[PDB]
Every structure is written in structure tokens, then in C-alpha cells.
């Protein structure tokens, strides 16, 4: 919350269950850690795949960290 | 989503009729035109296809259980 | 409607993938709100083999998707 | 509603095939079941790597059940 | 009904993540938690004696009284 | 209480083996536990690929516990 | 003795946190709630022996396996 609030408009790293790695601009989030990201991208086997708008279910989120 | 319009609901509402990339638990990747959804994020896709080992498998009409959805991303034009 | 579309598949053959890489095909007879399923003339597809199972009841908790086979 | 219970009702006393999460394959005579799909099986056996392992009486939690199908014969 | 009959007898229990255990069933509850005595794990076909073991029902696949 | 409760209450102060989801194996002295089987271990250690990694004090979530076995 | 008391006394200290799917993280414990959700600072992931610094990280309790203050 605190942190997520401070990260609105910032790029965040998100990892999910089943070894998924995503980066995106955090636009919104809720208490269930559901997320709306913009200019989102998946990092798969070292390759970047741009996705654009992405909504993420919080149930599978492992962690979120604003990119330095 | 119900209590989740600001994160999940609005984008899904706005994606009706557009092609979306959906990833599911157990490494499944599906693309399809979003036609409908419910409170539990179950989805209705038309002209849906699975991408397995880089290969495309067309399936037509697909009902997807929201319980196993990881993310939904409308494909950039 | 997710509901109408499944209603429309009763009596038809559908593809159902489940958690843990399971792939099944069968005639959709019945289904409930939790997407539990009753399939007839069902079969399991495993490494390309087809194993006929006949009548099969499927727990919706582990269902990934259902699609009619054209 | 014929969905789960109907078939199960009709398979009592007959051999059934059940697969569970984590690739488990079991066969056995269905003696009873409930609304959570927990099952009681007798003369049960596991099929591991194509080999059969007889177990006898087995209680199975419905939570990990994938499907149940009465054995065609 | 089956567990009550198995109090005092050896049972085979398999859990999520491929775990296989045998032990004497001493008690159980409505959540399918088990208390086993003289319990042992079977791992790669080798047996590891453990003694007293309490097992959470949430991860139980099946419980089978060992014939005999 | 006759299943998990008694044994955990009876294991306070003793070395327990705890296995968790995803193949994790841990041993430690059981100092406390709560309603959901979250555990407090002291002198804890992880066993990985046959090697012991000492960790000291460890809080363990009950949600992912498979079993708890006092070491004989 | 309390699990709560233990985590409280670890605030400001480096902790090792492991999660489902084999994730291993280290970081300075700043905040935690009753669901074991965590706020770590100067956090880093350890992947195949490699350390990846991440900075501030919120960790969902739902997938936490264990939390141990680094001795």
C-alpha cells in the first residue's frame, strides 16, 4: 500500500508463480495486490516481449519492487 | 471483479471485442477476442488459439476459468 | 454469455484442458456453476495416445478451459 | 447435478478410474462419496509407471481429484 | 468412518509433491490432519524412520490402511 | 487438538524435522506455534542437496507445512 | 517466544526469505503484518548463486515459506 502508492507512475518489477517475470508502469493496485500496468513487458529466457496494458491477478504475485 | 473495477474491471470492460493475450497457471498461453467475462474473471474468447512450444493451435470458442488466470493483456495494435 | 455458450455445447464434443497438463475430449452432457462436468464418450489424450474412458465426471476446480471442437 | 453425484451414485459397487493432482492414477471399487467428492474405494490400486500396486481400502480427498470415470469394463 | 477403524493400524499416506509415508494411525480430525507413530518416509525406495509425525490434512492425497 | 495440538504442545523445546511444499526440508528446536501451525524454530537449519545450511531463528508458515516430526 | 515478537525484533535487520517456486531473497526487514506480507529494503534476489539487487520490495505473505534473520 504505502510502497505501492509511492510507486504509481513508476516502473515496477513483478514476479508471479510459475516463474513469470514482468515489468511495467504501475497505474493502480488494490488490497488483494491486483494490478493494472501500462507499457508492460514479459522477460522470458532473457528476451523482452512488450505487451502494453496488462491486468494482473494478485493471487499469483510473489513480489513487487520498484525498479531502481 | 466487483470490488476491483479500478484494477481489473475497467480494462476488461474496455477490452470487450478486442484480441487479448491471456496466460494461465502451468505455463499456458492463449490469445482470443474477449467477448465476455464475469465476477470471477471467467472469460469468453472467440477465435481463441493456444501457443504451445511456439506453435499456434486454433480452438475457436473458449471458456476460460478465471481462477487460473495470471494476467490479461489486450494485444497492442 | 459464458453460460449461454456452454449451454450451446451440450450434446457436442468439447476439448477440456486441466491443471497438470491433462487434455481430455468428450461429449458435454451436463455442467454446473462450479464448472464441474459430465462428459460422455470421453477420452484422455496422452503423448498422442487416445485412451477411451466413456462417462467422466470433471471437477471444475482443476479446469483450465473448455472449447467446442469444430 | 447429474453432473457429479448422478454418475457417482450410479457407480457405487463398480470399479472406477480416478486421477489426482501430481499425476496420480488410481482404480478401485467406489463404496461411497460425498458432496466434496471425497471418496471411499475398496480393492483400490495405484497405477505407477504402468505397474499396478494394490492398496485395499482407500479414502481419497476430493480436493485433489481431477476426474472420475467408471471403468467401461 | 474408515479412519476410526484404522486407529492403531498402519496406514499408507501420500501427500502433494510426491511424498509417501507409512505409520500407525493414532488420531485424526475433521480436517484430515493425522497423528502417526512409528512413522517413516519412503524416498527413492529407501525408508527413513521418523517416529511421531503429525501430518496436515490440506496436502493429503489419500490414506490407505496397509493390508495385513 | 488431539492431532496437531497435543504433539506440538508436547514438542516445545525439542528438535523437530519439518518438510514443506516444493521439497524443502528444515530441522530446528520448536519454541512456539500458533493456531495456523506457523512455527518458531531456534537453531534452525535447511537441508539442501544433502548439505546443512544453518539459519538460526526461523519463522515458518503453517500453510506450506507437510508434516512436523520430533527427531527420535 | 511469540512469532510476532520475533519478527518485531528483526525489524532493521537483514533477513533471508524463501518463497514458493524456489525463490530466495535477502533484505532489510522494515515492516510485516499478520499475513506475513513484508516490506524489505536493500532487497536482493539470489538466483543460481548470482545476487540481483532490487531495492524496495513488497512480498506477499501467501507465498512465503520461511523468514530467518541472517546470523
What is the distance of C-alpha F23 from the center of its chain? 14
CATH topology of domain G1-71: SH3 type barrels. (2.30.30)
Is the sign of the CA dihedral E21, E22, E26, E29 positive or negative? Answer: positive
Closest CA to E16 of G45, A18, G5, D23: D23
3-class SS string, F26-59: EEEEEEEECCCCCEEEEEEEEEECCEEEEEEEEE
- Chain F positions touching E49 (Cβ under 8 A) are 72
Closest CA to C1 of B9, B5, B16: B16
Cβ neighbours of residue B29 closer than 8 Å, sequence gap 6 or more: B21, B22, B23, B50, B51, B52
Closest CA to A22 of A46, A42, A48: A42
User: Rounded distance, CA F3 to CA E61, Å?
Assistant: 18
Burial class for B38, CB neighbours closer than 10 Å (0-12, 13-18, 19+): middle
Establish how many alpha carbons lie within 13 A of residue D16's alpha carbon, considering only the half-sphere containing its beta carbon. Answer: 29
At which residue does the C-alpha cell 471485442 appear?
Answer: B17
CB contact under 8 A, E53 and F66: no
- Compute φ and ψ for D27, nearest 5 degrees: -130, 145
User: Rounded distance, CA D60 to CA D36, Å?
Assistant: 11
User: Which residue among F21, F65, F69 sits closest to E52, beta carbon to beta carbon?
Assistant: F69
User: Rounded distance, CA A13 to CA A21, Å?
Assistant: 7
CB contact under 8 A, D57 and E2: yes
B and C touch per CB criterion (3+ pairs under 8 A): yes
Closest CA to B42 of C6, C56, D21, A35: C6
Residues belonging to chain B: 77
Helix ranges, chain C (H): 2-7
User: Rounded distance, CA G40 to CA G42, Å?
Assistant: 7
- Chain B positions touching A18 (Cβ under 8 A) are 25-27, 70
User: Which residue among E16, E32, E67 sits closest to D22, beta carbon to beta carbon?
Assistant: E16
**G35 in helix, strand or coil?**
coil
CATH of domain F1-72: 2.30.30.100
| Bridge partners for D41 per DSSP | D30, D58
- Chain A positions touching B75 (Cβ under 8 A) are 52
In the numeric block, which cell numbers belong to residue C55?
Answer: 462417462
User: G20 CA to chain A: closest CA distance, Å?
Assistant: 8
Residue G20 is given by DSSP the state G
Establish how many alpha carbons lie within 13 A of residue A62's alpha carbon, considering only the half-sphere containing its beta carbon. Answer: 21
Size of the C and D interface in Cβ pairs below 8 Å = 61
For the segment(s) C1-70, the CATH number from 3.40.50.300, 1.10.10.10, 2.30.30.100, 2.130.10.10 is 2.30.30.100
User: Rounded distance, CA D73 to CA C63, Å?
Assistant: 27
Interface test with B, best of A16, A21, A55, A56 (most B CBs within 10 A): A55
User: Rounded distance, CA E9 to CA E35, Å?
Assistant: 12
CB contact under 8 A, B43 and C2: yes
CB contact under 8 A, D64 and E65: no
| CATH code 2.60.120.620 for E1-68 | no
Other C-beta atoms lying within 10 Å of the C-beta of residue A5 = 9
Q: Radius of gyration (Cα) for chain C, nearest Å?
A: 11
User: F40 CA to chain E: closest CA distance, Å?
Assistant: 16
Technique that determined the structure = X-ray
In the numeric block, which cell numbers belong to residue C66?
Answer: 473448455
At which residue does the C-alpha cell 502494453 appear?
Answer: A52
Q: What subunits make at least 3 CB pairs under 8 angstroms with B? A: A, C
Angle, alpha carbons G59-G64-G66 (nearest 5°): 120
CB contact under 8 A, B7 and A34: yes
Q: Radius of gyration (Cα) for chain G, nearest Å?
A: 11
B-chain residue closest to A61, CA distance:
B70
Residue A30 is given by DSSP the state -
Interface test with G, best of F13, F57, F65, F66 (most G CBs within 10 A): F57
User: Rounded distance, CA D29 to CA D39, Å?
Assistant: 10
What is the distance of C-alpha E18 from the center of its chain? 14
Resolution at which this structure was determined, Å:
1.8
> Do β-strands D24-33 and D39-48 pair in parallel, antiparallel, or remain unpaired?
antiparallel
D and B touch per CB criterion (3+ pairs under 8 A): no
CB contact under 8 A, C66 and B67: no
| CATH code 2.30.30.100 for D1-73 | yes
H/E element, G68 = strand G64-69
D and G touch per CB criterion (3+ pairs under 8 A): no
- Chain G positions touching A17 (Cβ under 8 A) are 20-21, 63
Q: What subunits make at least 3 CB pairs under 8 angstroms with E? A: D, F
Residue D57 is given by DSSP the state E
In the numeric block, which cell numbers belong to residue F4?
Answer: 496437531
H/E element, A61 = strand A61-66
CATH topology of domain B1-77: SH3 type barrels. (2.30.30)
In the numeric block, which cell numbers belong to residue C21?
Answer: 497438463
What is the distance of C-alpha D24 from the center of its chain? 11
Q: Do residues A10 and A66 make contact, with C-beta atoms less than 8 angstroms apart?
A: yes
| Bridge partners for F15 per DSSP | F29
Closest CA to G59 of G45, G39, G41, G44: G39
CB contact under 8 A, A55 and B12: yes
Is the sign of the CA dihedral F62, F63, F64, F69 positive or negative? Answer: positive
User: Rounded distance, CA C21 to CA C26, Å?
Assistant: 17
CB contact under 8 A, G66 and F54: no
Burial class for D55, CB neighbours closer than 10 Å (0-12, 13-18, 19+): buried
Q: What subunits make at least 3 CB pairs under 8 angstroms with C? A: B, D
CB contact under 8 A, B24 and C61: no
H/E element, F9 = helix F5-11
At which residue does the C-alpha cell 518438510 appear?
Answer: F19
User: Rounded distance, CA G27 to CA G19, Å?
Assistant: 13
CB contact under 8 A, C19 and B25: yes
User: Rounded distance, CA G19 to CA F52, Å?
Assistant: 19
User: Rounded distance, CA C17 to CA C44, Å?
Assistant: 10
- Chain F positions touching E19 (Cβ under 8 A) are 19, 66
**E34 in helix, strand or coil?**
strand
At which residue does the C-alpha cell 504442545 appear?
Answer: F9
> Do β-strands C13-18 and C63-68 pair in parallel, antiparallel, or remain unpaired?
antiparallel
Residue E32 is given by DSSP the state -
- Chain E positions touching F68 (Cβ under 8 A) are 53-54
Other C-beta atoms lying within 10 Å of the C-beta of residue D42 = 16
G10-29 as b/e, with b when 16 or more CB fall inside 10 Å? beeebbbbbbbbebebbbbb
User: Rounded distance, CA D62 to CA A59, Å?
Assistant: 22
Which residues of chain B approach chain C closer than 8 Å at the C-beta?
A: 24-26, 28, 30, 36-38, 42-44, 48, 59-65, 67-68
**B40 in helix, strand or coil?**
coil
**A17 in helix, strand or coil?**
coil
Amino acid at each position: 500500500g504505502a510502497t505501492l502508492q509511492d510507486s504509481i507512475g513508476k516502473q515496477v518489477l513483478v514476479k508471479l508463480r510459475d516463474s513469470h517475470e514482468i515489468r511495467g508502469i504501475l497505474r493502480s493496485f488494490d488490497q488483494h495486490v491486483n494490478l493494472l500496468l501500462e507499457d508492460a513487458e514479459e522477460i522470458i529466457d532473457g528476451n523482452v516481449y512488450k505487451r502494453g496494458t496488462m491486468v494482473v491477478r494478485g493471487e499469483n504475485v510473489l513480489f513487487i519492487s520498484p525498479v531502481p
